[PDB]
Write a protein that binds this ligand. Structure first.
Ligand SMILES: *[C@@H]1O[C@H](CO)[C@@H](O[C@@H]2O[C@H](CO)[C@@H](O[C@H]3O[C@H](CO)[C@@H](O)[C@H](O[C@H]4O[C@H](CO)[C@@H](O)[C@H](O)[C@@H]4O)[C@@H]3O)[C@H](O)[C@H]2NC(C)=O)[C@H](O)[C@H]1NC(C)=O
Ligand SMILES: *[C@@H]1O[C@H](CO)[C@@H](O[C@@H]2O[C@H](CO)[C@@H](O[C@@H]3O[C@H](CO)[C@@H](O)[C@H](O)[C@@H]3O)[C@H](O)[C@H]2NC(C)=O)[C@H](O)[C@H]1NC(C)=O
Ligand SMILES: *[C@@H]1O[C@H](CO)[C@@H](O[C@@H]2O[C@H](CO)[C@@H](O)[C@H](O)[C@H]2NC(C)=O)[C@H](O)[C@H]1NC(C)=O
Ligand SMILES: *[C@@H]1O[C@H](CO)[C@@H](O[C@@H]2O[C@H](CO)[C@@H](O)[C@H](O)[C@H]2NC(C)=O)[C@H](O)[C@H]1NC(C)=O
Ligand SMILES: *[C@@H]1O[C@H](CO)[C@@H](O)[C@H](O)[C@H]1NC(C)=O
Ligand SMILES: *[C@@H]1O[C@H](CO)[C@@H](O)[C@H](O)[C@H]1NC(C)=O
Ligand SMILES: *[C@@H]1O[C@H](CO)[C@@H](O)[C@H](O)[C@H]1NC(C)=O
Length: 168
């Protein structure tokens, strides 16, 4: 029962960024003879850590790994974007009680100001120099559709909305 982890945790990234898919727990552990399936098609890498450089739209997809005598892992979907702002989430579905992290991410990692996170059309938090909103113990009320606004350079921009569910 293998589980694909990501680092950064962000599973929605901008074009050109880099992310690493570890076929297990911590990056302190290593292993050989691992299988990667991007969109179902077997990959050419075997290292348990499958890196991804200058993300191309084609990198968007369903990924999973498997071992010599083990059933393949639950798939993980990575989506690549091109836009001024991207709302990132630790996890899109969360079990009542777990942590939840949202991050208003600016293109090319630039800086964003006058940031405001929105939940269900309502203003929620506001900061000059942006900050990633975080939650330790998650309520079920926190489920909702988020999106953030911010000013980049000197213009205002709105992000794609993102639904989030907290089950119990
Ligand atoms: C595994 O399956 C995935 C399907 O979910 C594949 O991802 C899809 O990949 C295609 C091709 O890169 C991507 O389409 C892109 O190509 C368009 C023309 O080149 C480009 O214009 C699109 O982006 C822009 O245009 C659309 C329409 O106006 C906008 O909606 C976009 O926001 C943007 O402005 C686009 O990038 C698909 O989008 C992408 N699907 C998803 C859900 O992202 C993987 O390629 C496949 N893996 C492999 C290796 O085959
Ligand atoms: C994702 O990882 C890759 C690779 O580690 C990073 O790409 C690197 O990008 C720099 C540009 O910042 C490249 O070097 C620069 O090239 C220009 C022009 O050739 C030169 O003027 C600079 O002085 C510098 O040498 C570098 O080649 C490239 N590395 C590789 C291996 O391709 C990338 O930055 C990472 N993504 C992010 C968002 O950081
Ligand atoms: C092969 O996978 C290992 C992890 O299993 C990757 O190793 C990490 O590499 C960085 C430097 O690139 C080290 O600082 C880390 O300590 C390493 N971690 C471990 C667990 O050894 C390695 O990058 C992968 N190799 C390739 C070419 O993708
Ligand atoms: C996020 O979920 C919301 C509902 O919580 C979706 O919005 C509504 O979806 C229902 C589905 O039939 C429609 O009747 C409403 O008109 C939708 N409202 C709006 C303003 O779109 C929303 O589509 C979901 N978004 C994603 C990305 O799944
Ligand atoms: C492993 O896969 C087999 C079928 O290939 C399935 O019967 C079995 O339940 C799986 N292992 C676990 C722990 O579920
Ligand atoms: C922790 O989570 C449980 C349910 O998941 C809830 O009853 C409790 O109030 C939460 N703690 C806080 C501070 O919200
Ligand atoms: C918030 O964003 C910063 C980028 O400067 C990042 O280093 C940090 O890990 C993020 N914080 C959280 C709680 O994820």
């Amino acid at each position: 029962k293998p589980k694909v982890s990501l680092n950064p945790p962000w599973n929605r990234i901008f074009k050109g960024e880099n992310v690493t898919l570890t076929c297990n727990g911590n990056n302190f552990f290593e292993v050989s003879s691992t299988k990667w399936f991007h969109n179902g098609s077997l990959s050419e890498e075997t290292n348990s850590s499958l890196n991804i450089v200058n993300a191309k739209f084609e990198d968007s997809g369903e990924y999973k790994c498997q071992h010599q005598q083990v059933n393949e892992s639950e798939p993980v979907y990575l989506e690549v974007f091109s836009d001024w702002l991207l709302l990132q989430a630790s996890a899109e579905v969360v079990m009542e009680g777990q942590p939840l992290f949202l991050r208003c991410h600016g293109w090319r990692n630039w800086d964003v100001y006058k940031v405001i996170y929105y939940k269900d059309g309502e203003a929620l938090k506001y900061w000059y120099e942006n900050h990633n909103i975080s939650i330790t113990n998650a309520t079920v009320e926190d489920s909702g559709t988020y999106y953030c606004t911010g000013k980049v350079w000197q213009l205002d921009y709105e992000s794609e909305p993102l639904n989030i569910t907290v089950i119990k």
